[PDB]
Amino acid sequence: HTIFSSLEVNGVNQGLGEGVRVPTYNGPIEDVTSASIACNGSPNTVASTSKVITVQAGTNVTAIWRYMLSTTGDSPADVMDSSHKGPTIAYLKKVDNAATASGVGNGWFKIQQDGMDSSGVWGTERVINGKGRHSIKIPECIAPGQYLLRAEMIALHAASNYPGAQFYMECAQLNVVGGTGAKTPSTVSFPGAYSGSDPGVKISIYWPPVTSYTVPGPSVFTC
Ligand SMILES: *[C@@H]1O[C@H](CO)[C@@H](O[C@@H]2O[C@H](CO)[C@@H](O)[C@H](O)[C@H]2NC(C)=O)[C@H](O)[C@H]1NC(C)=O
Numbered sequence: 001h002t003i004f005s006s007l008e009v010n011g012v013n014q015g016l017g018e019g020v021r022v023p024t025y026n027g028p029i030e031d032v033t034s035a036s037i038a039c040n041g042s043p044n045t046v047a048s049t050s051k052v053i054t055v056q057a058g059t060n061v062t063a064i065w066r067y068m069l070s071t072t073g074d075s076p077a078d079v080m081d082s083s084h085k086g087p088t089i090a091y092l093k094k095v096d097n098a099a100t101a102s103g104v105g106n107g108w109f110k111i112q113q114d115g116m117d118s119s120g121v122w123g124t125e126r127v128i129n130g131k132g133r134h135s136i137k138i139p140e141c142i143a144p145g146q147y148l149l150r151a152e153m154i155a156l157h158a159a160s161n162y163p164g165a166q167f168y169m170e171c172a173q174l175n176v177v178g179g180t181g182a183k184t185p186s187t188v189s190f191p192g193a194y195s196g197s198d199p200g201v202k203i204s205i206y207w208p209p210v211t212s213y214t215v216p217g218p219s220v221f222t223c
């Protein structure tokens with residue numbers, strides 16, 4: 001249970017729920033076929049925001065994960081329970097208007113992921129123990145303009161069967177400045193990119209102890 005509730009850019013937090021479309025409830029999406037898998041949604045409720053956050057292409061945005069919208073600390077329990085082991089992931093979608101695009105459908109491309117490392121530590125654990133900070137590089141070579149950023153943590157502690165994996169995501173609204181447009185990513189759809197049978201979605205992280213992990217979705221886009 002967690003929310004990507006604000007975004008930091010060039011050292012500046014853009015504000016709670018400002019430019020990030022936040023639910024007030026921190027529960028996961030469970031059905032990868034639901035429209036809610038794109039930018040969260042029913043049975044949650046997601047607020048709108050008229051802020052579109054500017055970021056220079058090639059630089060990083062940092063999603064700031066918190067337990068609840070009311071959480072004001074940054075200790076592990078203020079981020080997400082440490083049972084919730086799994087990957088962190090981030091995607092972009094080029095859109096006409098970052099405040100009105102729903103995010104549902106084709107156009108997403110993956111720009112970051114962190115599954116399990118060679119020490120057995122998961123991407124969510126680095127966020128939990130790193131003040132909720134999930135740092136994500138905006139590629140230099142993409143087209144400038146309006147985008148959605150979908151940042152995600154997947155908790156796998158109850159994922160032995162499907163349903164079971166817990167998908168926590170929110171969409172931020174970006175104005176990417178300075179992208180060269182030299183490369184146009186191949187894209188996937190949400191819903192569509194994940195399936196309940198994926199090896200990183202239906203997975204026992206206990207039996208046997210997990211030593212490698214396949215993050216769901218497409219390969220990371222690179223310039
Ligand atoms: C910008 O975001 C990228 C991820 O998109 C970060 O790169 C990762 O950094 C971690 C921590 O050092 C490494 O373990 C990974 O190997 C890096 N991944 C890649 C693909 O390079 C990067 O550190 C972030 N930069 C800043 C300044 O926050």
Ligand SMILES: [Cu+2]
Pocket residue numbers: 001002081084155166
């Ligand atoms: Cu939870």
